[PDB]
Scaffold this active site. Structure first.
Site, PDB file in Angstrom:
ATOM      1  CE  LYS A   1      -9.020  -5.524   5.067  1.00  0.00           C
ATOM      2  NZ  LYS A   1      -8.362  -6.377   4.038  1.00  0.00           N
TER       3      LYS A   1
ATOM      4  CD  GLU B   1     -24.424 -29.644  23.212  1.00  0.00           C
ATOM      5  OE1 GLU B   1     -23.415 -29.061  22.764  1.00  0.00           O
ATOM      6  OE2 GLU B   1     -25.515 -29.673  22.604  1.00  0.00           O
TER       7      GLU B   1
ATOM      8  CG  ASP C   1     -29.328 -23.051  17.867  1.00  0.00           C
ATOM      9  OD1 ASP C   1     -29.361 -24.300  17.878  1.00  0.00           O
ATOM     10  OD2 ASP C   1     -29.035 -22.392  16.853  1.00  0.00           O
TER      11      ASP C   1
ATOM     12  CG  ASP D   1     -26.736 -25.730  22.387  1.00  0.00           C
ATOM     13  OD1 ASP D   1     -26.441 -26.934  22.544  1.00  0.00           O
ATOM     14  OD2 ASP D   1     -27.692 -25.349  21.678  1.00  0.00           O
TER      15      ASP D   1
ATOM     16  CG  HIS E   1      -2.046  -0.976   1.127  1.00  0.00           C
ATOM     17  ND1 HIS E   1      -3.140  -0.778   0.312  1.00  0.00           N
ATOM     18  CD2 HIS E   1      -2.250  -2.159   1.752  1.00  0.00           C
ATOM     19  CE1 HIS E   1      -3.967  -1.801   0.436  1.00  0.00           C
ATOM     20  NE2 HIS E   1      -3.451  -2.652   1.304  1.00  0.00           N
TER      21      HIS E   1
ATOM     22  CE  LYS F   1      -2.025 -10.879   2.843  1.00  0.00           C
ATOM     23  NZ  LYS F   1      -3.461 -10.945   2.442  1.00  0.00           N
TER      24      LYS F   1
HETATM   25 LI   LIG Z   1      -6.181  -5.679   1.382  1.00  0.00          LI
END
Ligand SMILES: [Li+]
Ligand SMILES: [Li+]
Ligand SMILES: [Li+]
Length: 1223
Positions: free
Chosen positions: A768, A925, A1177, A832, A759, A785
């Site tokens: 974002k 559970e 649920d 759950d 960037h 990145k």
């Molecule tokens: Li990106």
RNA sequence: AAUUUCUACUAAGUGUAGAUCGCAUCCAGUAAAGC
DNA sequence: CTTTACTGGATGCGTAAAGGACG
DNA sequence: CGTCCTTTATT
């Protein structure tokens, strides 16, 4: 507050901190110039090689005993194994044989005189130089003459193979605990399932596999077990169940496949056999014949061009195969046949554009004869046609032509399709022509080259579909007249077109294998035990130690030539100095105290009394029948004195030992020696001289680092970064220990710096998060990145030991029960699982009141007024299909385990926040091995991961905001789960966690506790009449527009569980029913009252006429009773869900509560702060919590000695009486 | 879209929040394509 | 039945000082 | 005879 504070400093666990190491000054220069990294890189490849040859010798030594071993009294054990009734004293007898069977095998390995020298330096200097026969393999073992201690951790991995205990890596474990039970369990099944096997079927497996050398019944005999002890024998055994494929390519069926075929035609369930697991260290060559995959990219190409080009026979096979179809009319239209299968509905379409016409045309033929005018369409005639239409093996070409309505002629429209399919194959060659040329050279590796593979995948699939189409034309005949002039040509070509099927296989298995990547390699710096331990006495030996210059820690490594360079350094009063570590440690008091004080070197110096030398050998100090208290005291006083005379122990540590007359066992003495035996301190060493030792290259030095250590970071540190600071903090009184065994790796870059996603600085980047009110970041510096993989990185793995000296010693599951017995308002968390919601939390107080309930499909966090909600459930769905469609298309398969683990970390945090805030226990559970399997694509692998990282976090629970030195902080973290050893060791309860059964958790009425204990599936006309008469009344209530069904469960069978007994059912509400066959929906919403009225009109019933029980039984028609059950079934269908649909998953009840209103979960899902479950649920988690609240109620009665005798496992009958009384 | 490392971020400028037991070995399990 | 992938559970170690061999 | 690598000991 109250409950948590008790659980600190409970037990000892280790973790490992990881750190990027950064070279200081000229360190890297001297490292490159001395070629140190390339020697370790070359070694770590050779080290994997020497290990392979070592496995070759072990496997040989392994099989020398396993071939010739015969197990004493194997039959006698087997009889006890299948005993239907063992007593608790008879129960103990089976173990002692099973313990001795491992002893019998384990000692047989050890019994060899060469056993002990398999894990010493002799195996590399002596034995393997003899066993090996290669001149090169002999040379790769000589290079390791120096380094035998670098194998010590590998020799440990190999003595586990020769263990006698029930250890997963033991060979004795594999043969007896795993192979036997599987073999014996198969032994019981065969006797039950001997019935179905034909005598040729028995022989065919005997003929093809066993060679008649033994019968099949032989293997399930007790005394034939000795055959399957080896891998070579197992392959034959597994073959009886699985079968195998010969060289001739015939798929021989196996006993397990036969059992399925009997069960599929007769609709019964007979168990299938369990295959046997491989044997440890076996280099197992499979029995089934297969063609080996291509080694390298060059081969794949050279096969692809030569075998697939126009000149190649495979294309020539298409070039002739089309000719037959163009010449189709010439051959007998009764000599060519289209095979029969489910793939023929497609064939009917390719001619006249419709799927079922070939089926429907023939169904008019079978019907007219076998449809006597009375019936017209009974279920038997419609069903029997299905039996006949697949029994038919093939269809004559003329028999197909008769079906079609003119003008269309099958053979002309067959001539139309095939020219189209050979052309589409010709089209892919047009795009792919570059692959074939002799010149063409590949730009990028086949796995990195998605563009070239999709070209191969396109040509292979275009060739695969034309062949897979033609295969149906064989007809498997076995046919009276075959235009064998046609077929002889056809078989000539098709068998050559069958050659691609091996190529489609082998190529897929090459292209789709992960590309070659360079693993990081351990650094040794020319020392086999480099940096093993930090003790200052060993600093010369290991040659690496730690340094400190304020807020920055370094790692110093002294070159082999200058081992003692840092020892001659002294403090510089004026100029800058480093802080140098003075690590002192006394590992293993039980091992180190006798080793040193009974050693040859000091056996003379300390003259232990003649009593002592016999006390240790006779083991009178150890607890047991041998234990003597005064005898143990004599060892304690002897050890005490000899340490005081020992210089490097007495001076190094400050020793306080409670009066020997106070110890109750030798363990109590060793514990203080263990506890007082560790001291970390620092000294002053000149910076100007150390730095001179770096530029000179006599000392290498790296900075220990993570991003928290940056001078640009003003944020809360990583949790591991805290631990590191605490190790050397003076307020850490041994809570966290710096342990030995650190390693230093080199991870070469795997990406190129310039090629990364960047960037650019000063050009705005978009944010974002739709909630973040700042949608742009304009940075003055680049953002690469994966920059951490674009440069070479050093790695440092530093193990630490938390609570090596546990003060608080008690039973954790007991102390949790003690505080639940005395908590006035205890809280319970309910978690759950689901496929529509990954995880759902419900929090309740001591009275069953809901304080919190929310789904965890999405994680919500707020920082500084910035909300961010991530749809982790959506991420797992999209990443799952990014692997499914990746697997189909031969592309790269994305990793999802990190994503799932990253999700849990947010969840694991949220429960801990809930546990801290409400001081609440957790309820999960009770799931055994079976429930992992699911009908539809499962994320519930997240649930199993959810447990692990939750249990691990609770094992030492920390809040990064609390002061480290305070309770709950970094130094005094909570421990509220028993130490994680294995998933199999677990009981019903694990500290704060309770594993509770799920029976009646979901399909229960929270408002009233009502449950469906009725069975309503249709059995007969008569049972329905007995059904109706049982009800106390069946009536119509007109003022409410409802039907009322009052019943007593006692009149119905198998209704013992319910407490109230007296229930009045209703038709209130709408239900959801799934279809059994275009239409908009695959489900419909039945209106109950508007359907009882419906049914009661079809058979002329006066439903209004008072009680209807006698009236409904008056009917004599099956259709009334078989339809009534569906109306009956929906009334009890409390939970209404639809697959894949966001809107539908609701719980509706047919009973009125104390205020005469039905429970509709939908009347709650709208509410923000509801007081009852919002959905089926949350209803689960709510009851999962209440199941535990019942268990807390059991704890309130009992007494502190006897809470262990309290059973948390709820009985199904106690729970109903509790769900109906709680309201 | 930086990270000991993973996840989600850009979080006010080379980072933010949470989590993170490494290493080696044995073993098994799931998905996919072909047969 | 096979092959490829990715994934996970159960084991060992997380050590200083004695021991020996070696130039 | 000091140095570096190998073995050892079991609450
Ligand atoms: Li990106
Ligand atoms: Li941070
Ligand atoms: Li998956």
């Amino acid at each position: 507050m109250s409950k948590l504070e008790k659980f600190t400093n409970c037990y000892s666990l280790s973790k490992t901190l990881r750190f990027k190491a950064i070279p200081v000054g000229k360190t890297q220069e001297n490292i490159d110039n001395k070629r140190l990294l390339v020697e370790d890189e070359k070694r770590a490849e050779d080290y994997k090689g020497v290990k392979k040859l070592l496995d070759r010798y072990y496997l040989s030594f392994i099989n020398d005993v396993l071939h010739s071993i015969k197990l004493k009294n194997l039959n006698n054990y087997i009889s006890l194994f299948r005993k239907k009734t063992r007593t608790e004293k008879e129960n103990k007898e089976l173990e002692n044989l099973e313990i001795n069977l491992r002893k019998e095998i384990a000692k047989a390995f050890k019994g060899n005189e060469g056993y002990k020298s398999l894990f010493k330096k002799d195996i590399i200097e002596t034995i393997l130089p003899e066993f090996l026969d290669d001149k090169d393999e002999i040379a790769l073992v000589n290079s390791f003459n120096g380094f035998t201690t670098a194998f010590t951790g590998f020799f440990d991995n190999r003595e586990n193979m020769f263990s006698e205990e029930a250890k997963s890596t033991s060979i004795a474990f594999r043969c007896i605990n795993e192979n036997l039970t599987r073999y014996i369990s198969n032994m019981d099944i065969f006797e039950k399932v001997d019935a179905i096997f034909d005598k040729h079927e028995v022989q065919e497996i005997k003929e093809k596999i066993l060679n008649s050398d033994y019968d099949v019944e032989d293997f399930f005999e007790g005394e034939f077990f000795n055959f399957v002890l080896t891998q070579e024998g197992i392959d034959v055994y597994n073959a009886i169940i699985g079968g195998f494929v010969t060289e001739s390519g015939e798929k021989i069926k196996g006993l397990n496949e036969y059992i399925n075929l009997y069960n599929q035609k007769t609709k019964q369930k007979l168990p299938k056999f369990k295959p046997l697991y491989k044997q440890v260290l076996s280099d197992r060559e499979s029995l089934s014949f297969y063609g080996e995959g291509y080694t390298s990219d060059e081969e794949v190409l050279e096969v692809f061009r030569n075998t697939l080009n126009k000149n190649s026979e495979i294309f020539s096979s298409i070039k002739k195969l089309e000719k037959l179809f163009k010449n189709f009319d010439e051959y007998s239209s009764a000599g060519i046949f289209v095979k029969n299968g489910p793939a023929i509905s497609t064939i009917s379409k390719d001619i006249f554009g419709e799927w079922n016409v070939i089926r429907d045309k023939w169904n008019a033929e079978y019907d007219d004869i076998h449809l006597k005018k009375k019936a017209v369409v009974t279920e038997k005639y419609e069903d029997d046609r299905r039996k006949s239409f697949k029994k038919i093996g093939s269809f004559s070409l003329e028999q197909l032509q008769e079906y079609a309505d003119a003008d269309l002629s099958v053979v002309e429209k067959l001539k139309e399709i095939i020219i189209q399919k050979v052309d589409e194959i010709y089209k892919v060659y047009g795009s792919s022509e570059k692959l074939f040329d002799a010149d063409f050279v590949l730009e990028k590796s086949l796995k990195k080259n998605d563009a070239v593979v999709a070209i191969m995948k396109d040509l292979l699939d275009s060739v695969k579909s034309f062949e897979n189409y033609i295969k149906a034309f064989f007809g498997e005949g076995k046919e009276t007249n075959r235009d064998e002039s046609f077929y002889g040509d056809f078989v000539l070509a098709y068998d050559i077109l069958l050659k691609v099927d091996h190529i489609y296989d082998a190529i897929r298995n090459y292209v789709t294998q992960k590309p070659y990547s360079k693993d990081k390699f351990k650094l040794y710096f020319q020392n086999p035990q480099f940096m093993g331990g930090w003790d200052k006495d060993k600093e010369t030996d290991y040659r690496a130690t730690i340094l400190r210059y304020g807020s920055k820690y370094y790692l110093a490594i002294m070159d082999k030539k200058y081992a003692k360079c840092l020892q001659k350094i002294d403090k510089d009063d004026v100029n800058g100095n480093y802080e140098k570590i003075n690590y002192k440690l006394l590992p293993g008091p039980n091992k180190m105290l006798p080793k040193v004080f009974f050693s040859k070197k000091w056996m003379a110096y300390y003259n232990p009394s003649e009593d002592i030398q016999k006390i240790y050998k006779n083991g009178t100090f150890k607890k047991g029948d041998m234990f003597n208290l005064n005898d143990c005291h004599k060892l304690i006083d002897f050890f005490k004195d000899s340490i005081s005379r020992y210089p490097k122990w007495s001076n190094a540590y400050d020793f306080n030992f409670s009066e020997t007359e106070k110890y109750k066992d030798i363990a109590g003495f060793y514990r203080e020696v263990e506890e007082q035996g560790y001291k970390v301190s620092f000294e002053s060493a000149s910076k100007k001289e150390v730095d001179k030792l770096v530029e000179e290259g006599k000392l290498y030095m790296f900075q220990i680092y993570n991003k928290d250590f940056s001078d640009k970071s003003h944020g809360t540190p990583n949790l591991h970064t805290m631990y590191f600071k605490l190790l050397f903090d003076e307020n850490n009184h041994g809570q966290i220990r710096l342990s030995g065994g650190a390693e230093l790796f080199m991870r070469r870059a795997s990406l190129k710096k310039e090629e990364l996603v960047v960037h650019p600085a000063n050009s705005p980047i978009a944010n974002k998060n739709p909630d973040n009110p700042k949608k742009t970041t304009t940075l003055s510096y680049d953002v690469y990145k994966d920059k951490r993989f674009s440069e070479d990185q050093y790695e440092l793995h530093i193990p630490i030991a938390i609570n090596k000296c546990p003060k608080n010693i008690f039973k954790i599951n007991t102390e949790v029960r003690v505080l639940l017995k005395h908590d006035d308002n205890p809280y319970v968390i309910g978690i759950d699982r689901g496929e529509r919601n990954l995880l759902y939390i419900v929090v309740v107080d001591g009275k069953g009141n809901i304080v919190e309930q929310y789904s965890l499909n999405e994680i919500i966090n707020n920082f500084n007024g910035i909300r961010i909600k991530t749809d982790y459930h959506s991420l797992l769905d999209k990443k799952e299909k990014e692997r499914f469609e990746a697997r189909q298309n031969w592309t790269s398969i994305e990793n999802i385990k990190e994503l799932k683990a990253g999700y849990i970390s947010q969840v694991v945090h949220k429960i801990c926040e809930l546990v801290e805030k409400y001081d609440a226990v957790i309820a999960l559970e009770d799931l055994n091995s079976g429930f992992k399997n699911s009908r539809v694509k499962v994320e519930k692998q997240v649930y199993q991961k959810f447990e692990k990282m939750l249990i691990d976090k609770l094992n030492y629970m920390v809040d990064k905001k609390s002061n480290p030195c305070a309770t709950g902080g970094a130094l005094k973290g909570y421990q509220i789960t028993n130490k994680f050893e294995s998933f199999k060791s677990m009981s019903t309860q694990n500290g704060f966690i309770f594993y509770i059964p799920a029976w009646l958790t979901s399909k229960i009425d929270p408002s009233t506790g009502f449950v469906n204990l009725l069975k309503t599936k249709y059995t007969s006309i008569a049972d329905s009449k007995k059904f109706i008469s049982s009800f106390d009344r069946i009536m119509y209530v007109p003022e409410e527009d409802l039907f009322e069904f009052a019943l007593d469960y006692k009149n119905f069978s198998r209704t013992d569980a319910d407490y109230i007994k007296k229930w009045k059912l209703y038709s209130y509400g709408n239900r959801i029913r799934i279809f059994r066959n275009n239409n908009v929906f695959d489900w419909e919403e039945v209106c109950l009252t508007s359907a009882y009225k419906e049914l009661f009109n079809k058979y002329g019933i006066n439903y209004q006429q008072g009680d209807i029980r006698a009236l409904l039984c008056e009917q004599s028609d099956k259709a009334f009773y078989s339809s009534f059950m569906a109306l009956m079934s929906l009334m009890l269908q409390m939970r209404n869900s639809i697959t894949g649909r966001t809107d539908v998953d609701f719980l509706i009840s047919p009973v009125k509560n104390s205020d005469g209103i039905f429970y509709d979960s939908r009347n709650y899902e709208a509410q923000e702060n509801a007081i009852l479950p919002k959905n089926a649920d949350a209803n689960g988690a709510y009851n999962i919590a209440r199941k535990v609240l019942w268990a807390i109620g059991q704890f309130k009665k009992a007494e502190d000695e006897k809470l262990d005798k309290v059973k948390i496992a709820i009985s199904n009958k106690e729970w109903l009486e509790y769900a109906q009384t709680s309201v």
